[PDB]
Amino acid sequence: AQNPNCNIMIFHPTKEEFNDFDKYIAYMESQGAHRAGLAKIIPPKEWKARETYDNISEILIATPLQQVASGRAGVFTQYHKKKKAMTVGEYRHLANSKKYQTPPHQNFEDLERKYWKNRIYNSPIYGADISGSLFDENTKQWNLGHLGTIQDLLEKECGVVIEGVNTPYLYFGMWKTTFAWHTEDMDLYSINYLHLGEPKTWYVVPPEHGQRLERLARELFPGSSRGCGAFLRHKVALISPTVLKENGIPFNRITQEAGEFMVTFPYGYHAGFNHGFNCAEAINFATPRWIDYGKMASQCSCGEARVTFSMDAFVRILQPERYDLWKRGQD
Ligand SMILES: O=C(O)CNC(=O)C(=O)O
Ligand SMILES: [Mg+2]
Ligand code: NI
Ligand SMILES: [Zn+2]
C-alpha cells in the first residue's frame, strides 16, 4: 500500500503533466496521496492563473463575516456575525490596519504558536464564500472555473441526469481568519488555489481515521453532539493540534503559499487559518472513486447546515433513504 503513514504529499507536475486534470488526480492517488486527506500541487514554472492581480479591488464582499469565538484557546466554536458590505480594496486596508494585521513573527511555526495562543481573543473578518473566479479565461490548465462538473461525473458513472451546477468560490482572508473542522458537502473533493497574499495553514485527518476525530468532537462539544448527529457539518468547531496530540488523533499539517494548489480528498477532515491578507479560490469536484463516499456521507438534518441547491440531487440519488429527513432540515 502506498503512503501507509498517510503523510501529506507534495507534487511538482511538469507542464505536460498539467494538461489533463483527471489523469493527474488519478496519478496522485496511485502514489497514495489520498491517504493523507490533503495534497499540495506546485504548478509548473511556465504556468500562471492570470497576468496580474492589479485590478481586483472593486470586487464586492457583500457579507463579510466577523468570526467570534467561544470556549478555550484549544477547543472553541466560532459564529459568524454579518457585517456591512465592503470592496476588496476596503477589506485589504482593514486587514492591514493595526487592529487586524499579522504580528511580528520569526517563522511560520512561531506564527502558528501565536494563532493557537491568541485566536480566541480576537474576532477577524472573513470575506468567504463569494461566487466567482480570478482565473483568466485563457488559462487552460487547472482553471477552477473550467473543471468537469460533479453532475456530469454522477451522470457518467451512474447514468442518471440531474439538475444543478458547480461553480467556484472566492475567499478573502486576514490574520486569524479560520476554517473550522469539516469535510466537504457529500464528502466531495475540494481544490483550493491561493491566488495572492499571505499563507494559509492547514490541518488534516486521514480519511481512514475520520471517525476518531468525530468521536473526540462529540466528547469536546457535548451539547452540540446532542443537538445533531453530524454537527461538524455546521462548520463551527475548532480543536488545536496540541489537543489532537493529547487525545491521540492522527493528523498532519502543512502551510500553503501563494501560487500553490491544495486538494482535499473525500472524507478528509480539515481546518486551518490565514496568516494575513490573502485571496483563495476553491471548488468541489468528484471522480469515480468519490461515488462510494458520497453514498456513505453523513448528513445534518437539524437544520443548521443549510447548503446549496445542487446537493439536493446528490442526496436524492445516492442516499434515497435519507432524503426525506434531510430535505426537512433544508426546509
Ligand atoms: O480556505 C478556506 O477558508 C476554506 N477552504 C476549504 O475548506 C477548502 O478549500 O476545502
Ligand atoms: Mg475590481
Ligand atoms: Ni473544505
Ligand atoms: Zn445539524
Swiss-Prot record:
Comment on bound cofactor: Binds 1 Fe(2+) ion per subunit.
Cofactor: Fe(2+)
Catalytic activity from the UniProt record: N(6),N(6),N(6)-trimethyl-L-lysyl(9)-[histone H3] + 2 2-oxoglutarate + 2 O2 = N(6)-methyl-L-lysyl(9)-[histone H3] + 2 formaldehyde + 2 succinate + 2 CO2
Residues at which 2-oxoglutarate binds: 126, 192, 200, 235
Top-level enzyme category: oxidoreductase
Ligand binding (Zn(2+)): 228, 234, 300, 302
Gene Ontology CC terms, in alphabetical order: blood microparticle; chromatin; nucleoplasm; nucleus; pericentric heterochromatin; site of double-strand break
Chief place of localization: nucleus
Annotated compartments: Nucleus
Enzyme Commission (EC) number: 1.14.11.66
All copies of domain JmjC, residue ranges: 136-302
PTM annotation, UniProt: Ubiquitinated via 'Lys-63'-linked ubiquitin chains. Deubiquitinated by USP14 with the help of TRIM14 leading to stabilization.
Key words, A-Z: ADP-ribosylation, Chromatin regulator, Dioxygenase, Iron, Metal-binding, Nucleus, Oxidoreductase, Transcription, Transcription regulation, Ubl conjugation, Zinc
PolyADP-ribosyl glutamic acid PTM sites in chain numbering: 16-17
Annotated function: Histone demethylase that specifically demethylates 'Lys-9' of histone H3, thereby playing a central role in histone code. Does not demethylate histone H3 'Lys-4', H3 'Lys-27', H3 'Lys-36' nor H4 'Lys-20'. Demethylates both di- and trimethylated H3 'Lys-9' residue, while it has no activity on monomethylated residues. Demethylation of Lys residue generates formaldehyde and succinate.
The protein, known as: Lysine-specific demethylase 4D
Species in which this protein is naturally found: Homo sapiens (Human)
Parent sequence residues shown: 11 to 341 of 523
